[PDB]
């Protein structure tokens, strides 16, 4: 209704005026299939500028850090009705954030059906399940004998709604979900996606075997990028389109501006001598008329000896100089970059002409003396 005579009742069924002067309400407030204790005193007038409100400890825990929110709301909400609206909205938020605590699943379907469906798959495939039985992660084999993983996130009702599917390979995964579709259906789809990008993987395999792949290390299956160094102190980044892998890639060159020219020129000349029947390397060796080195240095390949903020060497005569007092990070920085980083963070604390504060990468104590 308009008035909070009927709108209140219709929107807060379980809040009973104890008192005749409708000043004390008590009982329950509803939120997300779950009803909770509430004890809401008014003064002699119908004014929330002064009002008492206590919870059960079950609710106060669930309005963890909205306490000040709701005090503000009480002083600046006009009506009791609108205040309840705001409160229910505010619960919905709390629970939707902390969705990790608040399942009762419907066991009769849920836990049994999951065993049924995983049985239908076969017991080799599953690798991880979290004990909330939310996340399950599964394993699939290529024709090429390469492992690819799939995360499923499951909802309260798996068989009703789509599982959320998270997977590695680089084109956007598509799963036709019906309420009739199940794990085997999404499994089949996943195998289809494997066999489809099969060529892209054979190409990336070939590169990572025959050559000094540098900038991804233990590269995922995600990556389209392969910064090859070749001879020494010169490198080419190669980004390949997955559907047409064998096709010419966009490729471009880092190193000495004198050494980059003739290669950049000969590419221009020989680009029409690309062919998609031979491999990327078997086109590149005869296009650029060179060989590559087969891991020219495999230990000190390259340490990005760069700022770790700006990712550049030589910021205004500053070198990556400033480092971490840590064996596991060792990440250089610049004075300027690291000062403008740590001074912005809340964690860091400033002595006279020194900043003690957390290394960006590893969050360990790092000191900067200007």
Partner 1 sequence: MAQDSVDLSCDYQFWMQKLSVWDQASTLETQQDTCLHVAQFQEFLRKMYEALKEMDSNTVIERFPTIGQLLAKACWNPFILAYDESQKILIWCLCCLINKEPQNSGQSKLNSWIQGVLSHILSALRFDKEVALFTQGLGYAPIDYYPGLLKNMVLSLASELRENHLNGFNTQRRMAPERVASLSRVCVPLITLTDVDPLVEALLICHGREPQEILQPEFFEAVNEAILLKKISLPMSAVVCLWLRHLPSLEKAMLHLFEKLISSERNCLRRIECFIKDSSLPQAACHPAIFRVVDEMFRCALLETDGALEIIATIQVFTQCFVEALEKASKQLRFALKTYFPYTSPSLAMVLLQDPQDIPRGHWLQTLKHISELLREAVEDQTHGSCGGPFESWFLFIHFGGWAEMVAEQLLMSAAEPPTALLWLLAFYYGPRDGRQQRAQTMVQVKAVLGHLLAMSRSSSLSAQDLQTVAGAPAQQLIRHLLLNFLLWAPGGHTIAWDVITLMAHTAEITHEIIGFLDQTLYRWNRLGIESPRSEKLARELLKELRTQV
Q: How far is the CB of 266 from partner 1 (least distance, A)?
A: 11
- Give the single-character DSSP code of 99: T
Query: Choosing among partner 1, Zn ion, none, which partner's interface includes residue 251 (Cβ < 5 to 8 Å by kind)?
Result: partner 1
Query: Choosing among partner 1, Zn ion, none, which partner's interface includes residue 359 (Cβ < 5 to 8 Å by kind)?
Result: Zn ion
Pick from 310, 319, 345, 354: which binds Zn ion (CB under 5 A)?
310
Comparing CB distances to partner 1, the nearer of 312 and 319 is 312
What lies within 8 Å, CB to CB, of 273 at 6+ separation is 283, 286, 287
Is 228 a binder of Zn ion (CB under 5 A)? no
Binding residues for Zn(2+): 307, 310, 324, 329, 334, 337, 359, 362
Residues that contact Zn ion, how many (by CB under 5 A): 11
Distance CA 315, CA 26 (A): 66
Q: Give the bridge partners for 52, in sequence order.
A: 41
Q: How far is the CB of 77 from Zn ion (least distance, A)?
A: 48
Is 324 a binder of Zn ion (CB under 5 A)? yes
Comparing CB distances to partner 1, the nearer of 142 and 241 is 241
Write each residue from 136 to 175 as x if it is in contact with partner 1 (CB under 8 A), else as -, in one continuous string: ----------------------------------------
CA atoms within 13 A of residue 238's CA, in its CB half-sphere = 28
Is 340 a binder of partner 1 (CB under 8 A)? yes
Residues 50-79 that bind partner 1 (CB under 8 A): none
SS3 content of the chain, % helix, strand, coil (to 5): 30, 20, 50
Q: Determine the interface stretch with Zn ion among 62-70, 150-158, 267-275, 353-361 (rule: CB under 5 A).
A: 353-361
Residue identified by tokens 């006009």 is 78
- No. of H helices and E strands in the chain? 10, 14
Comparing CB distances to Zn ion, the nearer of 294 and 362 is 362
- Which of 219-222's residues contact partners 24+ apart within 8 Å by CB, and which partners? 220/168, 221/146, 221/148, 221/168, 221/169, 221/170, 222/168, 222/169, 222/170
DSSP three-state, residue 262: helix
Distance CA 269, CA 271 (A): 6
Largest CA distance in the chain: 96
Is 268 a binder of partner 1 (CB under 8 A)? yes
Pick from 107, 108, 145, 344: which binds partner 1 (CB under 8 A)?
344
- State the DSSP H helix or E strand holding residue 193, giving kind and residue range, or none if neither: helix 183-196
- Give the single-character DSSP code of 359: -
Q: How far is the CB of 291 from partner 1 (least distance, A)?
A: 22
Q: Determine the interface stretch with partner 1 among 92-100, 129-137, 269-277, 291-299 (rule: CB under 8 A).
A: 269-277
Question: Which positions touch partner 1 (CB under 8 A)?
Answer: 239, 241, 243-244, 247-252, 254, 264-265, 267-269, 271-272, 306, 311-312, 340, 343-346
């Amino acid at each position: 209704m308009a008035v909070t005579e009927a709108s209140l009742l219709r929107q807060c069924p379980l809040l009973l005026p104890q008192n005749r002067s409708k000043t004390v309400y008590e009982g329950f407030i509803s939120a997300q299939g779950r009803d909770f204790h509430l004890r809401i005193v008014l003064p002699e007038d119908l004014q929330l500028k002064n009002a008492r409100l206590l919870c059960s400890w079950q609710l106060r825990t669930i309005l963890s850090g909205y306490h000040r929110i709701v005090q503000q709301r009480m002083q600046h909400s006009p009506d009791l009705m609108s205040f309840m609206m705001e409160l229910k909205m505010l619960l919905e938020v709390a629970l939707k954030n902390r969705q990790e605590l608040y399942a009762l699943p419907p066991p009769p379907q849920f836990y049994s059906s999951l065993i049924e469906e995983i049985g239908t798959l076969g017991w080799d495939k599953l690798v991880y399940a979290d004990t909330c039985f939310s996340t399950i992660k599964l394993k699939a084999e290529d024709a090429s004998g390469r492992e690819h993983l799939i995360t499923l996130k499951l909802k309260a009702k798996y068989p009703a709604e789509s599982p959320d599917y998270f997977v590695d390979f680089p084109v956007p995964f598509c799963a036709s979900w019906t309420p009739q579709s199940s794990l085997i259906s999404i499994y089949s789809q996943f195998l289809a996606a494997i066999e489809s990008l099969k060529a892209f993987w054979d190409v990336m395999d070939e590169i990572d075997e025959k050559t000094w792949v540098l900038e991804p290390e233990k590269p995922p299956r995600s990556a389209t990028a392969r910064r090859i160094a070749l001879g020494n102190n010169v490198s080419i980044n190669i980004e390949v389109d997955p559907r047409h892998p064998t096709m010419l890639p966009e490729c471009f060159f880092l190193g000495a501006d004198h050494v980059v020219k003739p290669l950049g020129i000969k590419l221009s000349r020989n680009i029409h001598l690309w062919d998609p029947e031979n491999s990327v390397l078997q086109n590149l060796k005869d296009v650029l008329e060179i060989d590559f080195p087969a891991r020219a240095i495999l230990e000190k390949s390259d340490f990005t000896m760069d700022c770790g903020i700006c990712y550049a060497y030589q910021l205004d005569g500053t070198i990556p100089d400033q480092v971490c007092d840590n064996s596991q990070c060792g990440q250089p920085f610049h004075q300027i970059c690291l000062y403008e980083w740590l001074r912005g963070l809340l964690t860091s604390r400033q002595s006279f002409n020194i900043i003690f504060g957390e290394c960006p990468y590893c969050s360990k104590p790092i000191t900067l003396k200007m």
